[PDB]
Amino acid sequence: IFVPLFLIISVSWVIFFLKDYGRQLEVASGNLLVFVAFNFTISGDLPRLGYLTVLDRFMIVSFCLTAIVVLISVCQKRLGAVGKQAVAAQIDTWVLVIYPLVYSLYIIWVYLRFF
């Protein structure tokens, strides 16, 4: 569970190095479906609980994070057509450090509370 999820996220972040607009949309959309499959697998061995565990909280972060990428990629593609390529490049640099920073914060919170 932990290892397969880590490579998938790491592989997606590597693709962000290239400035190939329109390729991130395919990767982000594909990553949305694979997370749904992982969501059902975890719930198979658990009852219908009325509260969220640590694993479900991690899945919520990944679900929301991959949604911003789709919105950002669409805006970058639309901005490039007008001719604001410089603005799109600036957004690419900013999103490069946001992706690992969000995941790092969640790990710290788990360690501070449960350890």
Residues that bind other proteins (CB under 8 A): 25, 29, 32-33, 36, 39-40, 43, 45-56, 60, 63, 67, 70-71, 74, 77-78, 114
Q: How far is the CB of 56 from other proteins (least distance, A)?
A: 6
Residue with tokens 């949309």: 25
Q: How far is the CB of 48 from other proteins (least distance, A)?
A: 4
Which is closer to other proteins, CB of 41 or CB of 104? 41
For 78, residues 6+ apart whose C-beta sits below 8 A from its C-beta are none
Angle between helices 2-15 and 85-114 (to 10 degrees): 160
Contact 84, 39 (CB under 8 A): no
Which is closer to other proteins, CB of 17 or CB of 51? 51
Give alpha helix (H) positions in the chain: 2-15, 23-43, 54-82, 85-114
Which is closer to other proteins, CB of 63 or CB of 106? 63
Q: How far is the CB of 61 from other proteins (least distance, A)?
A: 12
